Design a protein around this nucleic acid. Structure first.
Ligand SMILES: Nc1ncnc2c1ncn2[C@@H]1O[C@H](COP(=O)(O)OP(=O)(O)O)[C@@H](O)[C@H]1O
Ligand SMILES: Nc1ncnc2c1ncn2[C@@H]1O[C@H](COP(=O)(O)OP(=O)(O)O)[C@@H](O)[C@H]1O
Ligand SMILES: [Mg+2]
Ligand SMILES: [Mg+2]
Lengths: 794, 766
DNA sequence: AGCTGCCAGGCACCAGTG
DNA sequence: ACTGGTGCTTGGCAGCT
């Protein structure tokens, strides 16, 4: 209603504004007007509430006024942060043209869009956490999925088979922004995820993605990257790249590759395993008391992020795991020397992303130069270490003698945060800049001489010479002496208690000082953009050096932990099996104020399922987890919390624990995934669940399930249960064996020994645990009477 | 031994070391060291080599309210000499910015005799002062959960520290603050009494010790008299239905299991219109009273006000939060809008009096009197304050014209002088011929004539230049500084007067504070009763009757929350519990409706005992002392500990609701405990119990022993799914559905087949 | 060391001569 | 159609106390 708001009824300003806002209909538009970014209509109302700024209005000759808000251009970063923390994208519009030569409103382009998965600036990101853009897509048969780390170039592609692998892939990558195709059927994977972004179907067309990705990589086809085979993934990867290009609107030279992640190249862990193993996130949501809290004492941000990627994605290549282990063993003695030097390399990876996007600030290049200064010390230290993988990483990190020198001669020791104000480029780097700097010590040299000279000539002791941004340079005299000033003194600015003047000499100095300051700032910015021109050709080798430095940090880290926390090197056997001697839960052993009871395990194709019994709090769940963490750690190359481990190949880890609406339904569908997708190479942890509607309702299914895992699938299965009935299984079924966690009953109390023993328990301790919980003794007596009745059945 | 500015910060922190210290620094308050680290964690702000964290001045009240909501006291240190000029503690705030509208905010004190416990709460806004002497650990943990103090005073030597350890706002105090002769003296002097007999607490030494410490703390925190605190009341165990934390949490009274406010009993029942009414309604929900006298009176009121709720609720809405506004009148912190709202509420009382005049109900007519009229104070504020005054009195414009002759006089002179300076602008503008000429006002120059730069050179020679701007010149003349004196001295005399007339309004209002407090409380209760009357009528509730002996007879009853939330028809169900039929063993499916049927029993009992009508065609109900709930979900240990608590503390007047006790351990162990639990509850305690179980063996109970019956729910298979029927019918169940749910989960058919075989095998020995 | 209010640079608006 | 004056976000700081 009201105001038919056709093109002609709008002002030149609003015509141009709505045109640019139409290119970004559903996200905020910062709109450059002089020294402000301004928002309008609903953008202004929302921006007012989110940014906590005033909602005002611009006047209008045609109809209703225009809602309005905005912030000074020099304060954008603070408000951009406030927005991105809440998941808001923002289009940044700048003025391109000169207002002095524009008849109407000046040309305005959107130069970039800040979205939560495409941020590369240091103040909007978290140091030790990745921030990944992603694209997902589904059709009849399966999924395609891509991730990009814009602040590094790591571009990945996968084709998860089913709902549960896709779920576990979203869990593992944890994207900050998720682009998804409009026809996505399984919204239950995607709903209530952050930075969610519905995208047209055409953005996932295969021919277009192949064209765009080959263009980006400079290849004819993607044979060389291992993804020509993989249209499902490619379609997601296409949408992803198109988004990235649209948000940055510059070339993205740091995205020179893409890699497919195949199912069989890593150990797939279902979403429950990840949570129950508490790899980077405990069950309460926080980061305390995780696997990563204990294992992660990396000394640089990029190293930490790399370690967590490895923990979340164990590899199956025997060769890569052996090399990682050797590195850990070879570098163990040189931990204390290598670590303070690696710390000084910093997050070189993210600085190089900003270099590639041309957004690198003067303190970015200073820390890049500081990193180069650490390379010869690290080359010397790694020379002595006779390990082929250690020397390959020493080669990969390079030295960059010529660039370390370039940055030392071009930038101040400690430059400002930004280049806008100057003071970044050093003396000697450019001859023209130094003769344009005849000004910085031309001022107060000259102005103090003009002050004293005119103070003495005039005889007026209050006379001083100053500058003011608005009125320029001046000669100030006090009000009480101002009636004595020369008539030559042209009057410039008046104040309450002082008059200020200008004279032909000082005006001439004002014009020249300011023209040359503008010339010195423009040249400085030309020279700083030129630093990018000379650094960028070496981008590949630099990215390789960051990666080698980050991997060094991970491995030097894992070496130190292996020593400090008493870990041993695992070996690998040809067939399924796990043989542990005196193994411990790597996390529970650290947090426990008292000694962790170490425990064995024998698992093999002959001894492939263990039924685990023992009282509540007896240590059954812990024993299972620590098996899986030891498997996990072994398959990232790391040493392991035990006296000795021998471990076969694993394809998948499955965890089924107790549980939204119907708890038995969900527990049963989670069990079905396990029975449908497990193999002879999978490790399977089955913990206690809810009962069915009746007594033996659920035990029936636990028996039938156990037997399917023993007899059909033949996976390696630990099966913790309170059902003592399942201790008869070994008798009846090949591959199945009883173990139990020990407990001494002594008098009216129970002690939990946390020690695994072969065989079933002697008894179950339900009544005992209940008595520990404070159930009246008369009730426990009655329950023990009822128990004898039930035990006389057989 | 640090920098000159940080030498002052450290000495000031020594005065209040246990409290976070805001320290003024230009446009920011700034915290240092352990204050900076703790506050960056609590408030989501940065950490800056001295640690520092800063809040901007313009949002100081928002961030004070965030810290105070997490149990933190906060000292502010303003101006160069400095001093702690303000302190907010969580349990003693009364400012609308720092308070949540619809949540109570209590100060509390706790302490321990060899004889037992002492407890005391205070709502510093309402004046509501309560004490108790819980008999043991579990009852004291129960009063702590329910009252939920924002700040808890406690003795140095408190032995039972596990009761309060995790709580926010813990304030360790000396033992001499709980000395009893000093507690009586201070309390009597606060109340104007000689003994505490009239408040019914003269013989409650443990309780008074806590209330004395509480009072001293509140006083020290305000440095004002607290005249609105004129009474104290003692809650006794017999007076209410006790509920432990687990039960309070499982019945989801005001807070759902995920910490939210949605899908709770309060979300449905609480449609009150004033914030003071909502608070009173939630106090009732969490404290069912057992005195049927009080209960019959609320019922009567709920039925008598049936045809009067459409008329009353719009009017009551406009009364607003008169309770919290009166607190600020008592503390002399009330602002012009506080007085404006008090006026608007007085403007409603005549209409409310006429509407209630016809209501045939003795309790409504007494609330109608207690409500009062206050026509003289309504006139005062009508004449004294303008229609919509500014937030603060600071800048005047709050006193109306006609109220004071002296004030009108100074305003007429200030207006006359600004009228002359407007005419001065127009006169000087024609005389010079300079169209840009105007008169502005400033702090640093006062009044001045401005002329644009381009025209400034044609300024008359009698003008004296004072400020050059980028594109203008500002001058003064003797005429300007003469009429500047005229406006400034007039506006200032009229500002000091307004301020003194404002203070005078407190002198005239406060003499009637006691009756005003009774009016706001009565208006709150009306709001509650009228809400409950609208609820009963709208939601098809009925009025329960009370019987002398334990028993719950429900006809077609429902879960009051579940029925409003889901868009599927709510199947109503019966219940007949009596001394002859004390326990029901509930069998049947998962998602079958057991937990709902148990919880609705408890909700109906709870609602009957706040005086409300109930979701049912009929409910008769005997006395209940306690409601126990062991419903939902190391977990086995926590469930056994709750089970243990029930068996120790339940009586024959208790409602006990148990769910799948036994699941977690072995079949024989779990069944053995379940059996022996049923037995105890059924034979020893004789509590009216509902025992949901999966053990079908437990259905043999009714045959073995008296007062035990089977009931069950069933399901129905059709199409490609299950239809759980949600209808409770007599007898044990004859079907399980676990295997059926596994089939629909995708568990392979061949696994199901093997389980079917194994189930028949397993059941046949029974 | 603190309060106030001009200024930053884009537009459009509006009134006063063309 | 042309001149010269108004208006509006917030952060920085000159210019007064
Ligand atoms: N082997 C161990 N040594 C020392 N403490 C242990 C060990 N295993 C478990 N615990 C402790 O026992 C507690 C309960 O163990 P849990 O595995 O959950 O028993 P269950 O699952 O059988 O009921 C854990 O909190 C852990 O701290
Ligand atoms: N009487 C009923 N009429 C309609 N819906 C019901 C009824 N009883 C329960 N429900 C709904 O069915 C769901 C599952 O039943 P539930 O209360 O959990 O019993 P159980 O312990 O057997 O699973 C509940 O979440 C509730 O919303
Ligand atoms: Mg367990
Ligand atoms: Mg239930």
């Amino acid at each position: 209603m009201s105001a038919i708001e056709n093109f002609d009824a709008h002002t030149p300003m609003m015509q141009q504004y709505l045109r640019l806002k139409a290119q970004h209909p559903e996200i905020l538009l910062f709109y450059r007007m002089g020294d402000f970014y301004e928002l309008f209509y609903d953008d202004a109302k929302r921006a007012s509430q989110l940014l906590d700024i005033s909602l005002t209005k611009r006047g209008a000759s045609a109809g209703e006024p225009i809602p309005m808000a905005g912030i000074p251009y020099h304060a954008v970063e603070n408000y951009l942060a406030k927005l991105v923390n809440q998941g808001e994208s923002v289009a940044i519009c700048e003025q391109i043209g000169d207002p002095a030569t524009s008849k109407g409103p000046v040309e305005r382009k959107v130069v970039r869009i800040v979205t939560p998965g495409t941020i590369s600036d240091e103040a909007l990101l978290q140091e030790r956490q990745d921030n990944l853009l992603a694209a997902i897509w589904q059709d009849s048969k399966g999924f395609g999925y891509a991730t990009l780390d814009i602040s590094s170039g790591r571009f990945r592609l996968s084709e998860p088979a089913d709902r549960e692998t896709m779920a576990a892939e979203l869990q593992r990558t944890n994207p900050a922004e998720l682009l998804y195709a409009e026809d996505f059927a399984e919204m239950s994977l995607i709903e209530g995820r952050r930075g969610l972004r519905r995208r047209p179907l055409w953005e996932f067309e295969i021919d277009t993605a192949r064209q765009q990705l080959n263009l980006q990589f400079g290849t004819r086809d993607l044979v060389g990257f291992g993804v020509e085979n993989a249209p499902r993934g490619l379609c997601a990867a296409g949408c992803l790249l198109q988004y990235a290009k649209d948000t940055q609107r510059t070339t993205l030279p740091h995205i020179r590759s893409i890699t497919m992640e195949r199912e069989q190249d890593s150990i797939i862990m279902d979403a429950a395993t990840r949570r129950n193993l508490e790899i980077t996130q405990n069950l309460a949501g926080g980061a305390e008391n995780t696997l990563a809290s204990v294992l992660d004492c990396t000394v640089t941000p990029m190293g930490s992020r790399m370690l967590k990627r490895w923990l979340h994605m164990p590899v199956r290549d025997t060769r890569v795991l052996l090399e990682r282990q050797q590195t850990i063993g070879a570098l163990q003695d040189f931990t204390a020397g290598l670590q303070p030097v690696l710390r000084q390399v910093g997050d070189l990876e993210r600085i190089l992303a900003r270099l590639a996007l041309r957004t690198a600030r003067p303190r970015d290049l200073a820390r890049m130069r500081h990193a180069f200064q650490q390379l010869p010390e690290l080359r010397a230290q790694l020379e002595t270490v006779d390990s082929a993988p250690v020397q390959a990483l020493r080669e990969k990190m390079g030295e960059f003698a010529e660039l370390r020198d370039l940055l030392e001669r071009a930038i101040i020791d400690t430059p400002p945060v930004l280049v806008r104000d100057g003071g970044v480029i050093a003396s000697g780097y450019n001859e023209e800049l130094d003769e344009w700097r005849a000004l910085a010590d031309g001022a107060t040299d000259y102005l103090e001489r003009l002050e004293v000279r005119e103070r003495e000539r005039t005889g007026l002791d209050t006379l001083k010479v100053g500058f003011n941004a608005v009125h320029g340079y001046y000669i100030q005299i006090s009000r009480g002496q101002s009636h004595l000033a020369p008539i030559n003194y042209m009057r410039r600015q008046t104040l309450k208690n002082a008059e200020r003047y200008i004279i032909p000499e000082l005006k001439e100095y004002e014009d020249k000082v300011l023209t040359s300051k503008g010339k010195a700032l423009a040249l400085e910015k030309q020279l700083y953009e030129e630093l990018f021109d000379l650094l960028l050709p070496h981008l590949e080798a630099l990215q390789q050096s960051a990666s080698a430095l980050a991997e060094l940090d991970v491995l030097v880290n894992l070496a130190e932990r292996a020593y400090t926390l008493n870990y041993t090197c695992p070996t690998f056997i040809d067939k399924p099996g796990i043989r542990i001697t005196e193994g411990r839960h790597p996390v529970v052993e650290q947090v426990l104020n008292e000694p962790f009871i170490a425990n064995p395990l024998n698992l093999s194709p002959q001894r492939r399922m263990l039924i685990i019994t023992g009282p509540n709090m007896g240590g059954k769940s812990t024993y299972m987890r620590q098996t899986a963490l030891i498997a996990l750690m072994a398959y990232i190359g790391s040493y392991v919390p035990a006296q000795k481990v021998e471990i076969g190949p694993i394809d998948r880890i499955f965890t089924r624990v107790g549980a939204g609406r119907s708890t038995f339904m969900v527990e049963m569908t989670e069990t079905a995934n396990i029975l449908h997708n497990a193999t002879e190479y999978s490790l399977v942890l089955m913990d206690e669940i809810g009962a069915g509607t009746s007594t033996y309702d659920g035990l029936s299914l636990a028996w039938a399930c156990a037997e399917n895992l023993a007899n059909k699938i033949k996976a390696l299965t630990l099966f913790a249960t309170h059902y003592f009935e399942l201790t008869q299984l070994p008798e009846k079924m090949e591959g199945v064996a009883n173990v139990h966690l020990d407990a001494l009953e002594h008098g009216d109390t129970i002690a939990f020994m946390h020690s695994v023993q072969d065989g079933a328990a002697s008894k179950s301790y339900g009544l005992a645990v209940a008595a520990l919980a404070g159930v009246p003794k008369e009730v426990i007596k009655r329950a023990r009477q009822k128990l004898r009745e039930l035990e006389s059945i057989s």
